[PDB]
Symmetry: C3
Subunit: 424 residues, 3 copies
């Protein structure tokens, strides 16, 4: 329907970009999508204003879906696609369009149409932002987190949705990492968003870990470079550090991984068992500045982080393949523990017999079930941080109100042992 976004003027940041607020509509246009056609629910591409990794004011695009029989009070579903590619013609918005001549068409057609159809048939509003942006940086959380949040803001703006509108999130693999940074940032960057829940599995919580896991050792080592690419695309001084150190073979590989039509299918398989350190003159590159610091800002694991990782309280549903061969299980589990230790509300599901592929479907029907409850404000009180759902009773049920509030007010104070009571 539309061109390759490299040539579309829609995929350009206006000069007055700073006059736009964060999450504000710059301009709109109708879009015929497979997903909209199947649900009889109009879809539009929205050019909106967001922020980037250096707080320069930029823009991105997000496709939206308006259900023909909408739910009351309004509810919003935000699916985060796993682009997992460093090219603008692999962006969600373009590949959603009804049509067969877009390269990264595969990322939006496997499980995605079901979720988004689910949301729309539930009467919910659907939004999916090119969380990677015009930059198309991949695995950079700060750009992804703001872009997705503002994408929801933009959805509320475009349709004049109430400011208390309930907002739910889904996301697998890179879409999780998107969903998971949208939630870390959700506190500061978009406290106007009433986030009733965030369902996401296969989270690559720490970058450096996901790199070392795939680097030199998996047929998906292509993601190692696609990751480096996207971070250097979002951290310009890293680009400045990498470029003069790239060797002959290195320059071809980076140029290829950034070219047109180099989407998730090509990235996955195109560079199997490739050691990204071989592409570079220096293998000590991770320990060197600015790369070492950029990694430690681009992780959700607190024991690694160079910053204070926020701990969102709203309902979260999370899963992961124990046996994950692409996205490591150790960091995701670690993040869940750390967030639970500081009072998160994480329904944690571990799949013993699982593959990164197998878990994508395993987690879909539980998560979608879970989200419908969280829109009704009735996601199950379960034990945080257990591989399995464990249904704990309610304080305002068991104790009654005064005791419940007296019980809850213990958090922060000290037990008889000197150590301080945590959030419980």
């Amino acid at each position: 329907q539309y061109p390759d976004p490299n040539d579309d003027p829609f995929y350009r940041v206006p000069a007055n970009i700073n006059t736009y607020a964060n999450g504000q509509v710059i301009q709109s246009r109708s879009a015929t999508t497979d997903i909209g056609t199947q649900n009889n629910a109009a879809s539009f591409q929205l050019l909106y204003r967001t922020t980037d990794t250096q707080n320069n004011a930029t823009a991105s695009v997000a496709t939206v879906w308006i259900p023909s029989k909408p739910a009351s009070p309004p509810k919003i579903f935000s699916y985060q696609v796993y682009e997992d590619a460093t090219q603008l013609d692999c962006a969600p918005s373009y590949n959603y369009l009804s049509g067969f001549d877009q390269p990264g068409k595969g990322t939006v057609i496997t499980d995605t149409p079901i979720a988004i159809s689910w949301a729309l048939q539930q009467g919910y509003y659907a939004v999916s932002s090119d969380h990677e942006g015009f930059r198309s940086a991949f695995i950079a959380g700060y750009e992804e987190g703001m872009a997705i949040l503002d994408g929801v803001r933009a959805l509320k703006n475009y349709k004049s949705l109430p400011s208390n509108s309930a907002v739910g999130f889904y996301g697998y693999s890179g879409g999780a990492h998107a969903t998971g940074w949208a939630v870390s940032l959700s506190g500061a960057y978009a406290s106007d968003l009433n986030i009733i829940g965030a369902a996401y599995g296969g989270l690559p919580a720490s970058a450096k870990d996901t790199f070392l896991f795939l680097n030199a050792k998996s047929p998906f080592a292509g993601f190692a470079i696609a990751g480096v690419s996207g971070l250097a695309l979002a951290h310009p001084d890293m680009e400045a550090f990498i470029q003069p150190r790239l060797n002959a073979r290195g320059r071809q590989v980076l140029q290829q991984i950034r070219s047109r039509g180099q989407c998730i299918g090509q990235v996955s398989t195109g560079y199997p068992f490739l050691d990204t350190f071989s592409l570079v003159n220096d293998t000590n590159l991770l320990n060197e500045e600015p790369i070492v610091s950029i990694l430690k800002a681009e992780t959700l694991v607190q024991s690694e982080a160079g910053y204070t990782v926020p701990v969102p309280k709203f309902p979260r549903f999370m899963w992961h393949a124990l046996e994950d061969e692409i996205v490591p299980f150790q960091p995701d589990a670690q993040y869940v523990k750390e967030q639970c230790s500081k009072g998160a509300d994480i329904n944690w599901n571990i799949y013993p017999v699982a593959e990164h592929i197998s878990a994508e479907l395993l987690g879909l029907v539980p998560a979608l079930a879970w989200l419908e409850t969280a829109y009704a404000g009735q996601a199950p009180r379960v034990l945080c941080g257990v591989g399995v759902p464990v249904p704990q009773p309610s304080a305002f049920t068991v104790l009654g109100d005064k005791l419940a509030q007296q019980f809850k007010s213990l958090a922060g104070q000290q037990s008889a042992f000197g150590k301080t009571f945590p959030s419980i």
Copy 2:
């Protein structure tokens, strides 16, 4: 009531065996059994036609119990007893008979009469086949699997039961191994059977493994030799391989373990910590032909097998002692894991504080409770291959029909990562 089955003309393969179809009754006779008298349900021994480990046409017996007020629509319960002996006078049919002078009386008096009584009082048709056969081969799955399935067939024939009559399976320990092979073969050999569910714990999934565990290192080392015996009784080339390699001391042990009245009680207790390798010449005899091939054909663990292990879809309930001292937990754990990844429906229960005797009873009461759901077609949708039941919701619930069928067609296809969506 009857003579020793070795002397009984009933326990004989007729000469016209090939005129009979698989699961056709050759002749019947009254059996006055304790289980029948207890439940007010007439019982008969059915000599019926089956097939064996060399596809030559044979026979076996199965006792059946006809309830006084049978359930509608007809449902059939098939208990697999743990004979765990290589002797015809330890065969179930005989010891089921009212009387105290048969040697293998113990297997059908502990927990077994409760199981069959449950089914009969449920109004179900009850049958238990001498899964070991006239050969009384022990640990040979193929003879046991066919013998049981034909028992169900023959039970349907004897009573003119609808051909879609609902069929459930129970078995612990050697009865599990009986029941666990009846299910593998059920696909090819007995797709005529409406298999509504199969509850079985303490499975000796791998022959070789269950052997290695008991051999020379357990007070129940008798099951190691009783195993060797049972495979050689069903595999004549294994027989021919062992016979000249046995030493005098070995011949004594094999003659004894095969003698009259050497049933499960005498076998378990008769040979403590006995090293089967001393009894026969050549210590590498397991690695040598034809035994090595028979082992890798007589295992359900796909990583060992020399064949493609079937993965039945119908509802399954399975348990096991984590702390099991007779049947190793590792192979059964392995088998269950594997079948789930290829789309099995296995409700998995692991017992943390458990003993083989203790787990026999622990799992008995849930499994029967579970089967009654499975007879109503309502076995719990739970997460397959997880140690504890986790009720995951339904697709035709979460998605609705069109989204459900669209979701279901994902299995088999490719994700964006190249690898294939499994059965999920």
Copy 3:
């Protein structure tokens, strides 16, 4: 409100102590407590007659709270405070009193009041016995077990509550340990008490283990000596043994750890990383008599004990911080396994992300929720000794009553494998 109990005449054992029965009230007096004022429930201090660690007849004090709208039929709640001190001015009764001039005020103000308040508003009679006694022995189970049980008797006596009155227990940490010995002893010492359930987490089942765990390697090393002190106060020959071996520094630590106002707060933080062995000449002395014999009686765990550890059958709810840094997790786990293997009824809940302080709160509201069920005689049938609740069905309903009695009959007898059916 009242003086330091060392100076109070109420805190004295009368000379005719032997005229009193076990659990008979010596005399009472009103107590104006913070908890009493808040719930509108009159409170009294009860001096009552109990037994001690050498079967010589003694006395202790226990506070009670009588609800203004009592539940019918009478029900009793027995909260066990985690005194964790070898000093009488740290006793529960005194610190309960409205007031701020008691040193060990903290143990009765955090989670303790919410537990009791729950109880009173539910209509239960509340009691909390100074389980350590006038001796204030800490970690000495036999004095704690008898003191708490008689505290319950004394309360039945004081108000003339019927002899089949339902009696429930709560206790975490040192209060659990007390709660845990009162349950072992419940059988012998108090078959008159109708104990409907006992919820307790973080149990230091082994004295010797909890000693080693904290000793010299944890900031709570004060509990090592506070434990040691508490035993030597209740085992006079241990006192006689340690006293001449104390070196200069040792006598200072022991006099101090016992002096006034050295309560749980003072012990907890006051002696971090202190080696008990450094204080007393003879590192081998813990291995030497009579401490080694005292420790074997002291450990609840059987694999350690020098006696037959009782396995009470009534419902128990138990938790424990897996990552517990104060009360080691393994001895509670070991204890639980053993009790379950011998037919106990322990509902076991393990906390994955946990610290001693956090598990205190995690488990409190589930336990109170649970106890409310057990007072209704309907604590959940779940799988014993498993980290998570697995709802096991009723044998009677599944098998049927006649079959269930036969299944009950099977326990104690022999299985077909020779070993004996356990209690299941």
